[PDB]
Amino acid sequence: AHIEPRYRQFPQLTRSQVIQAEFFSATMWFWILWRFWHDSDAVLGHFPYPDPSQWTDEELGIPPDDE
Amino acid sequence: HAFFKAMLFMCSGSIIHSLNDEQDIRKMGGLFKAMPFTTTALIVGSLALTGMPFLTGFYSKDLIIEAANTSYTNAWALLMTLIATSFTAIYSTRIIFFALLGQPRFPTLVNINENNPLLINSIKRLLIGSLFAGYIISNNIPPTTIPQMTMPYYLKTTALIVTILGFILALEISNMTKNLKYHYPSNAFKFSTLLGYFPTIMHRLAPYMNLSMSQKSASS
Amino acid sequence: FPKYEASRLSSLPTTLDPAEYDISSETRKAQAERLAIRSRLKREYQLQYYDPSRRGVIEDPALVRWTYARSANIYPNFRPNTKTSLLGALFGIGPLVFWYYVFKTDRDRKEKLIQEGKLDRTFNISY
Amino acid sequence: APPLTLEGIKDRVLYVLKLYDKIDPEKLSVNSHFMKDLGLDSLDQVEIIMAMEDEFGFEIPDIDAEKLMCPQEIVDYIADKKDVYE
Amino acid sequence: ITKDMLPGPYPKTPEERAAAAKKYNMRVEDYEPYPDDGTGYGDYPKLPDRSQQERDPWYDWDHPDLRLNWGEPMHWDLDMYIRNRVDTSPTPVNWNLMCKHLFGFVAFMLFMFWVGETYPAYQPVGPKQYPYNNLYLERGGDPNKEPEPVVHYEI
Amino acid sequence: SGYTPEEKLRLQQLRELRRRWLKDQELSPREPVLPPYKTYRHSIFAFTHVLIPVWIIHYYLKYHVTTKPYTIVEKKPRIFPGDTILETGEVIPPMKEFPDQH
Amino acid sequence: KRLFIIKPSGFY
Amino acid sequence: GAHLARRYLGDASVEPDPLRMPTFPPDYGFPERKEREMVATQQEMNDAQLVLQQRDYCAHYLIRFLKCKRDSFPNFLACKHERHDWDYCEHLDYVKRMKEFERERRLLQRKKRREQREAD
Amino acid sequence: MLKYIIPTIMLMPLTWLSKNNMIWVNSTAHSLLISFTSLLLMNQFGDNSLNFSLLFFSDSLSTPLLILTMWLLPLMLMASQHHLSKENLTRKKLFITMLISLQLFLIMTFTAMELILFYILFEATLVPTLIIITRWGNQTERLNAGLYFLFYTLAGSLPLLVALIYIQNTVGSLNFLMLQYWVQPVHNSWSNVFMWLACMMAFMVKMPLYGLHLWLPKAHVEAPIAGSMVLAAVLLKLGGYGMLRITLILNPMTDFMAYPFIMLSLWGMIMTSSICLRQTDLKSLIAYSSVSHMALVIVAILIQTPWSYMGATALMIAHGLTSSMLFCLANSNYERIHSRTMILARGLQTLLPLMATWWLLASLTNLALPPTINLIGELFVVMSTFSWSNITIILMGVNMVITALYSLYMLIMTQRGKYTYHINNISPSFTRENALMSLHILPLLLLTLNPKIILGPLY
Amino acid sequence: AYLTHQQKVLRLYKRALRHLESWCIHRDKYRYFACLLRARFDEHKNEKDMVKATQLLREAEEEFWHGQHPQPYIFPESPGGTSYERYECYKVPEWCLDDWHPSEKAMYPDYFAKREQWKKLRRESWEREVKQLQEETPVGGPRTEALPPARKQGDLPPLWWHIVTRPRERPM
Amino acid sequence: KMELPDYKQWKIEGTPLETVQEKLAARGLRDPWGRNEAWRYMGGFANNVSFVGALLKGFKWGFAAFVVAIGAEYYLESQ
Amino acid sequence: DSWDKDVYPEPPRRTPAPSPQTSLPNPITYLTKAFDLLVDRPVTLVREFIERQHAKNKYYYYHREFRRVPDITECQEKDVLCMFEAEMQWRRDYKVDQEIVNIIQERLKACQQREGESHRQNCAKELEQFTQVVKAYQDRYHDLGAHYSARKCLAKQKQRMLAERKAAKEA
Ligand SMILES: CCCCCCCCCCCCO[C@@H]1O[C@H](CO)[C@@H](O[C@H]2O[C@H](CO)[C@@H](O)[C@H](O)[C@H]2O)[C@H](O)[C@H]1O
Ligand SMILES: CCCCCCCCCCCCO[C@@H]1O[C@H](CO)[C@@H](O[C@H]2O[C@H](CO)[C@@H](O)[C@H](O)[C@H]2O)[C@H](O)[C@H]1O
Ligand SMILES: CCCCCCCCCCCCO[C@@H]1O[C@H](CO)[C@@H](O[C@H]2O[C@H](CO)[C@@H](O)[C@H](O)[C@H]2O)[C@H](O)[C@H]1O
Ligand SMILES: CCCCCCCCCCCCO[C@@H]1O[C@H](CO)[C@@H](O[C@H]2O[C@H](CO)[C@@H](O)[C@H](O)[C@H]2O)[C@H](O)[C@H]1O
Ligand SMILES: CCCCCCCCCCCCO[C@@H]1O[C@H](CO)[C@@H](O[C@H]2O[C@H](CO)[C@@H](O)[C@H](O)[C@H]2O)[C@H](O)[C@H]1O
Incomplete structure (x- = not known):
């Protein structure tokens, strides 16, 4: 056949199978980097998270303890 | 899930076929270079399964986790779900480490061959799907909810970090198999291997009781 | 090494059985006759299994005895006594009486609710 | 899977035995008894059978394995199991 | 076959035990009938309650799938012990210990789920607010009745 | 522990018979003795497995299924502020002005 | 080498 | 979040109960609160066939996005600004709910001081 | 009904006057022609039944049963002519005469407008049935099987005769049309408790009711194949058909008299399903399968709802074809190996690939795979018993699980695994055997396309 | 047990190595531990006391049970393996060919001509095979399942048909 | 007729099998099957990528393509 | 058209006119034109041919009209001849009412x-x-x-009428 078996030895590889595998492995990493560069928010956060303790009583309308 | 899970099964079929119907990972190894295209699909499928950013599995799984920890939920179910997400990286590491890495452990008559176009094309189509199908779909489906996007930084990245930690820990565990040490199994190890004894107990006890009652009491 | 606690559905490995070891000429004599019986039956089967002119089934008396034992032979060897009657009473009458009260109680409760109008049947018109 | 042949099976059976440090590869022949000629014991013969199983990817039961006492006997046993007739 | 070769009543003498064991192709020593409780076993040999999976795979059986030999007495429950049904082969973990671990895991999981249902996890956020008297009309509220207004303010 | 001389001889004799039986399983050159472009093939497949069925189904749906009430029920089209209605020419008003906070 | 494949009669 | 640790392992009486919140009048402490405006009419949301849970105070932004999605078809990568407008509005809606929780917590804290000093 | 009674009788002159070598061809062909014309009975109306004369009428309940009965006669002839080949010629014609006379009694039984005419024909079917079992069965026990069949039936029938005659005295008529308009309610009393029992026990034994079923596995295991076919397909349904008619005049007493028999059926169906898991005899397994299926029919008839009556009618037809097919399938194995032991001949899908398809289809209908009419009937019954009491879904659910287990166990044990080495007379399936199987399954699967004609009068 | 003491030790040795292999996985690590395990067997190789030797076997088996791999490696076509009995559905007994239709047999004229010689050879040999088993079997039947070889030329080993003509391990 | 490689070439030196023989040699033991395992550590089976190297397969060309693409996108966006 | 819009009402259709906001060609527009050309036109002509043959053989069928007869309330006790007609009429009305509920259910689901x-x-x-x-x-x-029968239906109504009367008496 086009590929003969070997005994106790590394098998015979075609150029086509090696090249195609490298192309799709590269395409995976190009894709992730391209998306990460353009959509980094989707993995790190889209909006700031406010600190509730930083809000003043005037914003929250907490009346002074005297009243 | 349909894309990369079907691909993973097809990649394992490629390995099983080349190793004369061998399915035990302990008897594989060294296939990373011997089977280059099956290896690329297996790595892409594994990364898609573990929610690697922007692969098909990230667009569903990642949203689910962030909705899970920002919801009014059982605290135990949330904690169980996160730990299982880490376990996903661990067993994904196992398949890659044992099937593809290290030295070959299969028989001597090497017949590895992944060069059939039917095999290459069928996996090739699912490989493209496992890279872009998630992105394509999320950008085309109409919105039918209110996605939760405001949350603490640590709730946003919980899915990613527990996955990374699982990868790191899984790698350390895999490396210890190489050391020249022998350890007796733990009760935990046996429990995991024997599937919590559920098949062992229940598939002997239920059949026995029902079948014995059928003959002894119902009939005789 | 915690020992092996064998059960009905988890038998005892022969390697851990004392009976396997500490053999005597008396046991070895027993294993001899068991093997002799096996070979006598094997020979009788092989002579019919290998017969060129045999087309059909090799009737096995062991199989006929098994099927005959588990049907036709039971009643002649039956005795009405405490064990058979207590088991017969428990598993023949008992389940019927149990299910009677389950369904009768449930149906009686529902019937009362329907009379008082307390069971919702707004769209129930298929029965 | 590529088919087996009697010559092919013999080659690999001898090949494995030539990689066993307890045998003399020049003194080895298809008809060498593992104890009478090669002077091995039975613990060694279990290992040889174990290595033949690993070589061909199938198991020889212990009842059958303990009788294979020279390389030709192994070659015959494998050929019979795999339906090799040449 | 013939009546003398068919199963019979419980054997009552050492000689009747000998003819029974002969009939079932057994040794008079190895032949032991079921107890005579009146359940209908008769003289059928009681055999070791072992699954067919336990028998030697490599022996050359007359019925390899059943792992039976032509003519040997069949267990009373042979059809329950075929390789498709009840398996009694030894387990690498004792039976009782297996039950303790599986039960313990399951029982513990259920308890922790209740604890998590009493102490639910939620975010520090007020109730989500909807317009038009909490969408009274949309949810199916009666058009004729005038709903109790629901007013939401800024903050 | 090896074979007895009697056993070896029987294994020898069965082996010659078996290898002869296996040899006889091979087929002769004349056996079995039987009794007496892509575009085109994909073009014929599309014709017989798409066009002809979709002809039948459209005829079935148009002149039999849709002639009965409520056999095909469509979700009504979404109407957005500013849309124009084809059936009438009615123009849907735009929404009121936003605070335009960005 | 093409071997003969034993099958039950398919004729009937 | 930390709030859970405080409520469960600490004094829960000063932490809001998410189910029953709010437990103070809306105007208590606020001189003249305004009422939240709603842009989209009920008929527009009805005609747009929005999912009932999407018919909140940001619905007008959702309607704009949905109209843009249909009109930009098949360019499924357009309408990014409209999506973000809707997402940002929902973010602001979420922060408002966060303030409501903090307000409730501080009032509970206040009412504990205002009770303790009156107690002693 | 004379357009069916008379040509059925003419089958007897035809068989006796046929050339010695044409008795099977002639009787089979002309019994198929009679089956064809029976479709004219499907001239049914929404309000009125089809009332031909003072003696016979045909509604939507009896019409499908009549068509099942007349379809079965040609199938029984095909199934018998092999094992009767060595039979004496006159004794072959007498065998066929017993089958023709059974069809005659049966089609008159299902169309009798008067209940005492129904009783006589209902009883008359015993004689040909008993003679078939005891004359042309193969084993010693066929004689005991005949006696159990005879005396179980008569123990129940004779009380029914007294009750019907008492009913005619008090009401003045037993005409079923008249009973519909002159029916009066039954008020509680020990006198009516035993009138109710007398009216229902004869039919309960025929179904059979669990507890009273012991005659059935005996009869099946000893009957010849044609006897087993009619027994399972039709004669069991005489109990169901009789109950569906007589319950008209038992109201409202059926409200509480049903309880002991619903309990027996609901629990009995799980017990007989589980018995099938441990049966060693293939025919006995199928016999016990019928008891489990007919338990549902008894429950459905007794809860007296429009959905339950539709379900019972479909179950009786679906079971008739499926159980008859299963007996025929097991028989084809028996004609080869001459034993009914299920485990004797295994792995037959390797040796008889097409007969293994029939085994698969027969099993799938037996476990009620949707949308078969087996599933339609069983589902409608389960819907109605759920409204009767919600907890019944537990018992219905378990039975469905156990029914699948023994149906596929029978398939796996006989058809799959390894073939038995020493059994070497498994000849290729004959055309007669394959046509017999297809004439069971094809009409059964065709009825799924148009199930209203087997759903009964309440459709 | 009909196994001698030697058979039990050798069987335990093999079984212990295979379960050791499952634990180690890596071939270098397995080689290191297989040699230490062999050293332990060599340690008591010369124990001449049967009582002690049997006692050593008992403890060894006890240790193996504690240390056995819960999921050991199995050769795919071995009992319990993932390919055990995978091909039984394709093995068809040769007597099925007697039922072939003549039109089916006409397609392989040469195969069925040879098949007739084997069937002819089977009939001719049968009588001598039964006779040979009659003359060599002691009164009271056989005591073992061993069968004799042929003792003359032109004789075939008794009971050979179903061994010689058994289905190929990869039939279709 | 298949050609097996000459058996003399399988040596344990320079492989982890040699470390095993050194550890066993320190106890007085030997590994007589070491050469039957050597072929798994020699030839094209020697030197297999690490787990990180496995994941990073194709990263080099993927990163280069990513760098080119963004630069190309930038140069267009500016103009 | 084919059915009655009163029995099966459909609210008037409102379709938004296309408002393409993209330069790209719309795939649905051209596939629709292909569908009309390749499927609708040939299927339409084949139907018009069949509609020509039917017009040459025009014949009619009718919906049966059932005269009203006295209901079971007017029947003397055990008078089968009058009971039979009232009973058959009640059965016909039972089927019709079943289809009325089906029509209202069909509207609800549509x-x-x-x-x-x-x-x-x-x-x-x-x-x-x-x-x-x-x-x-x-x-x-x-x-x-x-x-069920007309008699059982009547007995159920009378029981209901009695209960309504007694409650009204309590008022
Ligand atoms: C949509 C984004 C698309 C991104 C596409 C990016 C370009 C695709 C590049 C495909 C590369 C194919 O070319 C392949 O590359 C690898 C790595 O250099 C080479 O591999 C090279 O390194 C290894 C290890 O040292 C050697 O064993 C091998 O002999 C050598 O050739 C292959 O021999 C070559 O065939
Ligand atoms: C969402 C996707 C997340 C993907 C995460 C991918 C994996 C992340 C990196 C995990 C750790 C990387 O690997 C880190 O470096 C080297 C690998 O060269 C390892 O080093 C190891 O390599 C050799 C392998 O022969 C071992 O024998 C040795 O014991 C050890 O030094 C470290 O033990 C590990 O901590
Ligand atoms: C990531 C996973 C997250 C979920 C983790 C869930 C944890 C579940 C733990 C359940 C433990 C149940 O199992 C429990 O273990 C101990 C330890 O053997 C058992 O203990 C038993 O074995 C030994 C005896 O040799 C002794 O400890 C004790 O005499 C005996 O009772 C208990 O009988 C058993 O009930
Ligand atoms: C498989 C077997 C199934 C068996 C099912 C058993 C059902 C049992 C039904 C019991 C109820 C019988 O019906 C009941 O009979 C008695 C007859 O004396 C009637 O009552 C009559 O006799 C009793 C005497 O006991 C008087 O007190 C009463 O004044 C009188 O009217 C009741 O009005 C009626 O309710
Ligand atoms: C063989 C299986 C054995 C399992 C055990 C089965 C026991 C079966 C008992 C039969 C029923 C007996 O109980 C029966 O209940 C019904 C109610 O529906 C009663 O029916 C009567 O009484 C009720 C109130 O009790 C009233 O509405 C009315 O007078 C009437 O309906 C019967 O008077 C009574 O006889």
């Missing part, structure tokens, strides 16, 4: 699909009409049993 996410508010009339008709059908026919 509305639920047509209105989409707004069905909860836009199918209130259909739900109300369905609720009322199911109440009327339940009162007439529910719980009569498999052996």
